[model samples]
Target: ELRVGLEESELWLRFKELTNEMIVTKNGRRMFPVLKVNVSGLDPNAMYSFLLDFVAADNHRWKYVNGEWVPGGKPEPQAPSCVYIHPDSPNFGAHWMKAPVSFSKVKLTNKLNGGGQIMLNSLHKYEPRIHIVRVGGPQRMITSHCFPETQFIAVTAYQNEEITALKIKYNP
Candidate 1:
């Protein structure tokens, strides 16, 4: 019985209410208020790998205007999906449960062919997902989870003034 939990519920809620926005660039951008989580109910001796992926939350392209996000048109075809593997992967469950898991090193990019970086379309909503895989011996299966409140729209530049304000307030 593997269980996964998000680390910063309040932060995620606040970002969700304001409509979380993530910046994506040609060179790739690291997410702020990054995906952090906790895990429990694992065999201490078992080896496990952690992974992160971002998926489209909706099918429509969005445009920010009049202080709101409006449907602009059908979204562009998605780029080849990529998974950011945790750097300290294939570690024991005990090692994972000892501290909160953070995907701070994972990055999002608009480049379709960037090696090892998660690719995303600008102006599209995405939900970041986490996967835990039991490794080492046989009986390998992936357990996945997502925080609905962590969903956000990707943009090349700051689109919403409120988001910009919040980013400055919290980050400063």
Candidate 2:
């Protein structure tokens, strides 16, 4: 049988729930939740790949003002082309997911940590996706739909909104 496991990050457990609070400018704001997962039940000899991407919404800009999530009030003439990579790559599936897996290492900054804040326009919605791939011979890798066959047993830091719940689950 396949197994999956999940755990929430300590950072998220300390955050306050969404009540429409505004973060102080220049102050570091933490992601409300963190995610960690453990996966098993794959062919021990097989290789796998993983990827996570943040869903995009309509183009817009936002800023923090007066303790509330507000719009930038104007569309920027140029939108910076942004790119994100999945966390699960460049490794064999069994080796990577064999033990406790962490997605909490992912840090989102808004110029505070010196890393570009993941651009999210206030009130704009986004979704996160997770994918798995298989490794092939001769340095060639191919996407495998068999990932769905792996058991997902746990979830962590999963955000639950009116439309979706970003929770983590895993198997043991």
Candidate 3:
């Protein structure tokens, strides 16, 4: 069996800590947390898929009340239906693994028609997930497999200290 282990990179870890440590104002602040994965299980010339998903705060939908954030009420019958695909997908799998590979180096803009950056609610809790797609031979169909989900809270309402510890764990 092939062994896969997380090779902690310090650069991303430091970035995440910095963002989470800083105080967030109503004006909103962008997160420095980014994923820089290294995979080795594909042909150099083949195409691959990458997806990033935001997890709901809880089993129930949330709303703001009083002077602080609180659970609105019962969970919605269905969660929000939205799809977010990374813009630089379908790239060569092996090419992405070359030295100096880092998704944290990606740039996100607010331009229209642009694959929008991850949408997050301020001060809300969320989890980020990554999925990989592989195309099968002869079928020409893509098969998708999701990686283990990583949990995180939104800095929308308030900066949660838990996020700081979490970021440090995965970042490096």
Candidate 4:
């Protein structure tokens, strides 16, 4: 069996209240307050891999102006879904359970063919998900989890003035 949970739910909620915004770029932008989690209930001898997948949170497009997000219209066609495998993978379950797993290196980008980067659409909402994969054993299984409260909007530029302000104030 596999189990996954957020590492610091309270910290995530704090950012969510600010309307968590992730900056995407033509190249790539690392997520601020990166997705972190804790894993448990695994066989110590089993090897595991942790991966991240980003999906469209909704079908609506949004525009942020005058300090708010307004409906921009139907969202543009989505790019192919992408999965970012954590750099430290294929480790024994004991290693993963020893500490919180962090995807700090995962990045968001608009470029579809770049070097293994997760593709995302600007001005769209997205939900980040985690998948724990059991590798090499009599049987392999995959378990996924997502925190609805951690949903965020992606933008090329700072849209919501309050988000920009919060990022500057707290992210310093």
Candidate 5:
């Protein structure tokens, strides 16, 4: 079986404690708590592509009230969907195993025609997922992984100050 694990999970958990908030804008905004990972157990010579995508964490559209996230109403019709591909994709597993797999390049946005970045609905809760696709045969997905502690609400701006502080501490 193949394997993939989160990196800096401690940092993500710290943000999760306050319910992480990721900014989505008309232009692309990079994901903070930036999804990084250590992927393993692949066929050494096979070509692989890594990917990131976000999905609703729950059915509720969230609202920030009294410095807390309150779930209410259903989210808006799904925004334009896009997958963030690790540009290093379609590389040999041997090469991928040579170094850490990081997605500092993944970006989030709410624009209807959000260019190439993954689109999300503001005030919606989302969880990030990682996928691995094997190339050569039919180029099908071989595995996927998710980290719950990395869940966050997509907002145009920060809803929780605690998350802001953590973002400052870790991001800049």
Candidate 6:
């Protein structure tokens, strides 16, 4: 069996205390405290592809009101769905296990993004997922994993002051 592990950084753990937010834009915005994960249980001779994508956590729209979040009204139409393929995909298992894999370079956009960029609506919560694929002749095997702490809300700008401070502190 293959195993996928999720690891949180110092910055991410701190942001977890409050509702973490990721800034989305017309072009694209990279996620702070990007998803960092480790993988094991692969056939050294086999090839695999890694994928990063986001799923809506719920159906209701959200608003940060009076210093907290509340559900109200309906969420705006979702942006076109897209998945991010790790740039160096279809690599050998030994290579993948050689180092931790990161989706750090991924950018989220609010527009009709293409294959490389993920599209997400603002004021919405999402679960970031890691998918693994292995090809065997005429068939393939697939698997994905996600952690609750990896969940976050998407915004055009930081809505919470606490989250904003952390971003500055770590980056500076």
Cα lDDT tens digits, model 1, 25-143, are 88788888878899998898999999888878877888888888887665566643578899999899999999989998877898976487778888888888888999976899789
What C-alpha lDDT, on a 0 to 100 scale, does residue 149 get in candidate 5? Answer: 82
**Which residues of candidate 2, in runs, are more than 4 Å off?**
1-6, 9-32, 56-88, 109-118, 137-172
**Total clashes in model 3, counting residue pairs 3 or more apart in sequence or in different chains:** 6
Best by lDDT: 1
Residues 1-172 of candidate 5 have per-residue lDDT tens digits of: 7888888999999998898999987877888877878877888988998888887877778899997889886544653246788989889988777777888876788886635678888888888888799987565666888889899999999978888888998876
Question: Per-residue error at 140 for model 5, in Å?
Answer: 4.0
Q: Which regions of candidate 6 deviate over 4 angstroms? A: 9-11, 73-80, 136-138
Q: Which ten residues in a row have the lowest lDDT in candidate 4?
A: 72-81
Q: How much lDDT does each candidate structure score?
A: 0.85, 0.39, 0.45, 0.81, 0.82, 0.81
* TM-score of candidate 2 against the unseen true structure: 0.43
Q: Deviation in angstroms for 71 in model 5?
A: 0.3
Off by over 4 Å in 3: 1-30, 61-73, 77-81, 99-101, 105-115, 135-149, 161-172
Alpha carbon lDDT at 165, candidate 5: 86
Q: What number of clashing residue pairs does each candidate have, in the order they appear?
A: 0, 20, 6, 0, 0, 0
lDDT of 4: 0.81
Clash pairs detected, candidate 1: none
Question: Model 4, range 77-135, lDDT digits (tens) per residue?
Answer: 66446789999998999999998999989888977765767888887888888888889
For model 5, the superposed segments whose C-alpha errors exceed 4 Å read 74-80, 138-141
Tens-place lDDT per residue, model 6, 1-172, is: 8988876555566887788889999889988887888888988878888988888887667799999978777755553346798877888888888888888789998887555678887888888887888865356888888767777889888889989988888773
TM, every model = 0.93, 0.43, 0.54, 0.90, 0.91, 0.90
Instruction: Predict model 2's lDDT versus the native.
Output: 0.39
What tens-digit string does per-residue lDDT give for candidate 2 at 1-172? 4455444433223222322121212333333243455667655666666544344333444433464435556654432323333355556656766666554444332333454334432333334334445566456443322111111111121222310222222111
Model 4 clash pairs are none
